[PDB]
UniProtKB/Swiss-Prot annotation, chain B:
PROSITE patterns hit by this protein: PFKB_KINASES_2
Residue numbers binding K(+) 1: 168-169, 171, 201
Protein name (record): Aminoimidazole riboside kinase
Record has Nucleotide-binding as a keyword: yes
Function: Phosphorylates 5-amino-1-(beta-D-ribosyl)imidazole (AIRs) to form 5-amino-1-(5-phospho-beta-D-ribosyl)imidazole (AIR), an important intermediate in the purine and thiamine biosynthetic pathways. It allows the use of exogenous aminoimidazole riboside (AIRs) to satisfy the cellular requirement for purines and thiamine.
Species in which this protein is naturally found: Salmonella typhimurium (strain LT2 / SGSC1412 / ATCC 700720)
Residues holding ATP: 146-148, 175, 180, 208-213, 269
Annotated 5-amino-1-(beta-D-ribosyl)imidazole binding sites: 12, 27, 89, 150, 240
Positions that bind K(+) 2: 234, 236, 275, 278
Amino acid sequence: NKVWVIGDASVDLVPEKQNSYLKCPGGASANVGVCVARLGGECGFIGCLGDDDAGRFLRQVFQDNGVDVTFLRLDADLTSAVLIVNSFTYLVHPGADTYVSPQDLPPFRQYEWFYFSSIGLTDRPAREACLEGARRMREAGGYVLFDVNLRSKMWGNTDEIPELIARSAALASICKVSADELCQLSGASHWQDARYYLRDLGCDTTIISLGADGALLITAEGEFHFPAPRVDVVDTTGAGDAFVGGLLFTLSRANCWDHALLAEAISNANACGAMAVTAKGAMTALPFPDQLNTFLS
Amino acid sequence: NKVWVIGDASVDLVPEKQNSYLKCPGGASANVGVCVARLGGECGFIGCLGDDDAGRFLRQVFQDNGVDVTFLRLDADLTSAVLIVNFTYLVHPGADTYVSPQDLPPFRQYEWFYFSSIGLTDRPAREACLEGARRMREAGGYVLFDVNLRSKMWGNTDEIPELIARSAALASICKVSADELCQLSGASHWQDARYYLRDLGCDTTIISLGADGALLITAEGEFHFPAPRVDVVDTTGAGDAFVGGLLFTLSRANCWDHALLAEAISNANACGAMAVTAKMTALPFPDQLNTFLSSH
Ligand SMILES: [K+]
Ligand SMILES: [K+]
Ligand SMILES: [K+]
Ligand SMILES: [K+]
């Protein structure tokens, strides 16, 4: 089954010396799409980008990775995002990725997956596109994966976040969150004191990440933990996207899913989450089918 | 006497190796400040930049060159400009654009204040510039208006003719380019337009001609200063280098007279060439300037 990712794609400039930036492809939604594609899965990107430099560059990157771009439109009246890893400093104000809208949605099919995060929720056009997209995917008999990739500093009135988060866990088949983001949401200092936070918001399945520590699967059979490989950081950029990437690649192999698949899924997550940190780009060390096993064992 | 430059400070991204850009210091007001500094003059930058990588990067370049940054304010809610060439922009609010009148320092007799239309395009910056010129004049100081016309960057191209004239009014000396004259006057030949600013209140005008040097317009008449012979390869930042060397001279005294004004333009043409011949950055140090003024 096909995995549809909707959201941001951008150029990330990460330093090296005391006078230069390394140009890498990026965007939470882009990283995830390229991750799922590289693992041999079938993935499609739904979004907007300007018909500019950054636009065509990132577009090309999708093609070189096997990511369907039929529904990725490039508007010349727009400018594609560019940030600088220093921990992010965004440069483009409205950000082309925020212009995607319900018209840009592809017809959905049974058992397919729809992915989106709060980043897709910041500005209006996109916001509608995401929530409608999830609505249609569920109506089509499909699954929605909401990654509450909380980006406080990107929002205009942080007084919309708690509300849009709840309406996503609602539509969401599976919600993925980080230890930090839970605390930062529940207002709690100990995530564990509020780890049924999303569940009580409408989502029955939660996958809470924990760094080089792994993840915590929270369904109803109980809380299951998974270990993260021996880390050796080089650039933490995109660990989270690689994690969700491997997660969808797996879930997408079946039509239905249970703890079983949910465990092989999270194992792939923790794995793809560790590797990616080894390189210096958000999606530089995203594994191929043959590089994943060599690292696995 | 100290030279105060107010305006743009941005990080220019230039292609390089493989999918890697390199930081380049830039900004008409920045280049000038660095120019004046390098030549062993006393210069201070008044402006804004984000406290982002760039913002702090630029502050460094200013320090490594002897440019006072006491009045260079680094905000957090702002974002320093960044351009990518191959000159497409990215940051539109523009941090350097948030500089305001309360970021201005105290001026003192015989000091120079510099600014261009680039500083006049967005709001806080615009007030900051006109107020800065007003104060420097009241302090018995000097103002150098460089009508560095950037039609594109301007939102309402109608505000330009008006802001240029109000500026000429405050200026002690106005610097303009041959084409810049044609743009405002609308004439094809600039000579038919050499009094455009004169009629706007500026008694002294320096019209840059590039390779042909420079024409000076004053009450007593106009005098031509030819340019040094060089292999023209890259004209970037030539204008900033020209104005930089110009301020570095007029400051070395209290009240420029026939002779100092005469030598200032020679420094300008000079500093303006080292640019077109070499690789901004083409700014020289006193040692290199001299070895050039001669056999070079
Ligand atoms: K749900
Ligand atoms: K990385
Ligand atoms: K005047
Ligand atoms: K040049």
